[PDB]
Design a protein around this ligand. Sequence first.
Ligand code: HEC
Ligand code: HEC
Ligand SMILES: [Zn+2]
Ligand SMILES: [Zn+2]
Lengths: 136, 137
Amino acid sequence: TKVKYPDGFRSWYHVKSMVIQPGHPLENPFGGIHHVYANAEAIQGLRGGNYPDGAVLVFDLFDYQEDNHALVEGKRKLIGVMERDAKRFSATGGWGYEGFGEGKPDKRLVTDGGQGCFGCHAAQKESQYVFSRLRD
Amino acid sequence: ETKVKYPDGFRSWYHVKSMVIQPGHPLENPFGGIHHVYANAEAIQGLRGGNYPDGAVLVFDLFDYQEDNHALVEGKRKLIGVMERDAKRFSATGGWGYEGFGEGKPDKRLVTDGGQGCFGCHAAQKESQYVFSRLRD
Ligand code: HEC
Ligand code: HEC
Ligand SMILES: [Zn+2]
Ligand SMILES: [Zn+2]
């Protein structure tokens, strides 16, 4: 009941991006440029289906540098992961939540079974706890 | 056989990188906004350090953004820029054909000069085969 590191996530479908700048409520620890990636099974849930077991969403978070009014991606700070499994992750609404420091498999960030992540994502109960929407 | 194809299905390609260009930056006009770069399989071979096969396509996808409480949030697509690799067909602009599609729409072709204006700037990157983007992790 550990969330698996999502190997190969960089090849997945890019859902959307967003920039969180200093002063935003989510600045700690989610400040920077982030990109949302979805594997094939996650796309089915985003498209209006049910999320099948095995669906994975990744929040990929980079630092950035402001250089002459351009924001340039720097280093990866972390990834956030949601893995769908209605049985194994029932305590947190059927998604398992993990963070990986710097995107590395050995740097697990979550220490409370994913309850803190869950507490905020629960506001999106109506949409299977996922905030991101497909855009074209 | 000098027209760049609209790159259908580009949104499911590999996302290379992103950048934000804000007011004040030298390129705000016309490339202001949040942009994402996508590459098909052939372009990845070229980005990786391999050579670019004919048929390689790189997409610059440009969105306006809105400021919302210390967040920049994606707004409407302004345009896509497309580079399509064909050493013989597009030899006049370095082996890449350049096109722009207004709001990403296949009917809104933007380029009127055979790609010369696009090529004039990308020519600065002769040494990486006219491509500014670099792979990252
Ligand atoms: C509110 C205080 C949050 C906490 C705590 C966590 N997340 Fe989150 N998450 C939040 C928002 C507002 C968004 C949308 C960002 C956007 O670009 O729209 C997200 C997104 C994710 C995603 C992408 C899928 C989605 O739901 O949109 C993942 C994979 C994700 N979050 C994981 C995650 C983990 C593992 C957390 C605890 C370490 C966690 N989130 C906390 C808001 C909040
Ligand atoms: C300088 C004045 C430019 C002109 C005119 C054009 N482009 Fe460009 N392009 C420029 C830069 C600095 C970058 C990199 C952006 C980044 O995030 O690093 C780009 C990128 C592209 C790409 C992505 C591939 C790459 O070379 O990195 C495409 C497909 C591309 N540009 C197409 C394009 C077209 C079709 C143009 C005329 C309509 C065009 N570019 C003009 C700088 C400049
Ligand atoms: Zn403020
Ligand atoms: Zn600035």
